[PDB]
Amino acid sequence: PFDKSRNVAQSIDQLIGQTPALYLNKLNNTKAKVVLKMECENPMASVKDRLGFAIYDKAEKEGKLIPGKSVVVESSSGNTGVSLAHLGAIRGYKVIITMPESMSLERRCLLRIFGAEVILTPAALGMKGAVTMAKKIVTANPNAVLADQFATKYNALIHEETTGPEIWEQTNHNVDCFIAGVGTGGTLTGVARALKKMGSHARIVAVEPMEDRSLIDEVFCVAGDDAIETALKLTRSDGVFCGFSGGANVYAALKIAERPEMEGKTIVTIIPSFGERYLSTALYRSVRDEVSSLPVVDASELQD
Amino acid sequence: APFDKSRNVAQSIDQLIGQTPALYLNKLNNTKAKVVLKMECENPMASVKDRLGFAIYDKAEKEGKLIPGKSVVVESSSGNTGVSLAHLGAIRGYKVIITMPESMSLERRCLLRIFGAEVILTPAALGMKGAVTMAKKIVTANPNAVLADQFATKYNALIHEETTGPEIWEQTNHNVDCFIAGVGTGGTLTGVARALKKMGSHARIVAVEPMDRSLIDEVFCVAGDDAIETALKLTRSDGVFCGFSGGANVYAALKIAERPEMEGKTIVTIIPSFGERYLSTALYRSVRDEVSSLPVVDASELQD
Ligand SMILES: [Cl-]
Ligand SMILES: [Cl-]
């Protein structure tokens, strides 16, 4: 349990997790409390930092990654790939990312900042092209290891070990409902398991955006436009600046917070990622378009 | 009994400002000194200026100089100071107007506008001076408008004397031999130096300059090319992702770390801003130009 107030970290690893929790304030006009678990405050700005750490930590203990021998091969360019590149670099591993050429230049650049080898695959073959290429690499080099196997193996576990228990402690053992995205790669499974291990009867709600069954009490559907509108209202009302998945979660949480049986209760949801990564994407396009056509004051007004 | 954000739920994103982590430089430090990085990049809006933003609103309100829902906050800033004022202003219900030259990036316009700030553009030729002139015109024309710079002057050093400096003191276990930060303005330098000397520290105070004066023991000049190179080395060695200022500070720290008299000693410096804000600027153009020319694997190698 690393205490940031009284210590200097040996490694940026130690700054992963132990993220803040924040009550929704202006945007919450309901009779329920809504707690945001702020995973956007991780060192590389998303929840997936916990997964990147888990992969290196747990696979090394298993002897399946060997620092400075293993080449880590990851067929994904989103936050899991960012965290693997980030933490691979400081542990001494070469990291290869395979990604379609059609993924954004900005995604390429962030991965390369950490010294990953970025290998581009044909747009017309999509995500499958990148998976084929990763497999080609591992077949050719017996030192190379596919990361996605470990992402699958450890993801729910790290959230049952860390994220879930943090929420339990931060809310002082008071969670009536926990809400997160159904996507997997996320916190849903592990947080749900942690809560159920603590005794908690909390309602578990999976959020499914639109264009383990035992663990999930309800799937709540959220329209894309509502997730996007919510992300922008959240920043203006409460100063929380996040991506699409956080907007969808907050939209869902605010609806569920108005249910009669949720009055006086505590609802917890996740803010997975900081918003700045998405400024150039469709999420904030409306704002980009607005600022693109602003007028300019004439110099004749400014030279008195 | 001061709020513990790792163990309790915050009422406001304000409470998550400051109390940032501190991190030892390792792979990049091949000296016999210890270099501690104060990780201001970990603030809620990804820079040290969150502390100044908060100090401005909190202290101006307590002195009746800003009145929520009445005062219009006006700032001439193409930097993080404007970003923080816009971010925290929105939460508190203030209208915020930011003036900046038309030559600043769309990304920067977009960030401010995400908070709901009014963005006013001034001629490229007149630079920041023209943005300053316009801010003063706006304030002249609205009796509810106030110029934020006056507050930044009054409160900048004080907030770092009260918060950043005492944090550094506790985090290093009362053990600081040298403190290094940028002259700029908005820097931590004056306030931290005052805190350190108040708490009995004999730390040497070093002002970093590109190529209160009585608290400074040494000016250290850093060429821009060394600042830029150092920013990119930092990501790949230690996973620290920052801007130009942090690059320059770390370069200076590493050179001071080589002095015989610093053997065994503790040097503290500041990482002011997270690097993501700068990914599409000149600082990381070397990486961008590289990933924009990568070859694409031929479909024939992967089509199944
Ligand atoms: Cl998100
Ligand atoms: Cl910086």
Residue numbers in the entry:
A (entry chain B): 4 to 214, 241 to 333
B (entry chain A): 3 to 213, 241 to 333
Task: Give the published text.
Leishmania, a widespread and important protozoan pathogen of humans and animals, requires cysteine for protein biosynthesis and as a precursor of trypanothione, a glutathione–spermidine conjugate unique to trypanosomatids with an essential role in redox metabolism and antioxidant defence. The parasite can also produce cysteine from serine in a two-step process. Firstly, serine acetyltransferase (SAT) generates O-acetylserine (OAS) to supply the substrate for the second stage, which is catalyzed by the pyridoxal phosphate (PLP)-dependent cysteine synthase (CS; EC 2.5.1.47). This de novo pathway for cysteine biosynthesis is found in plants, bacteria and some protozoa, but is absent from mammals.
The structure of LmCS was determined to a resolution of 1.8 Å. The biologically active unit, a dimer, constitutes the asymmetric unit. A surface loop from residues 214 to 241 is disordered and is therefore missing from the model. The LmCS subunit contains two domains. In addition, residues 307–333 at the C-terminus form an extended helix–loop–helix structure that stretches across the surface of the partner subunit. However, the crystals were colourless and there was no electron density to indicate that PLP was present. A fragment of the crystallization agent PGA-LM is bound in an ordered fashion to the same region of both subunits of the LmCS dimer. The interactions between carboxyls from PGA and the side chain and main chain of Thr83 and the main-chain amides of Asn82, Ser274 and Phe273 are common to both binding sites. The binding of PGA may have contributed to the absence of PLP and the unresolved loop between residues 214 and 241 in LmCS. In LmCS, the placement of these two residues ensures that the active site is considerably widened with respect to that found in orthologues of known structure.
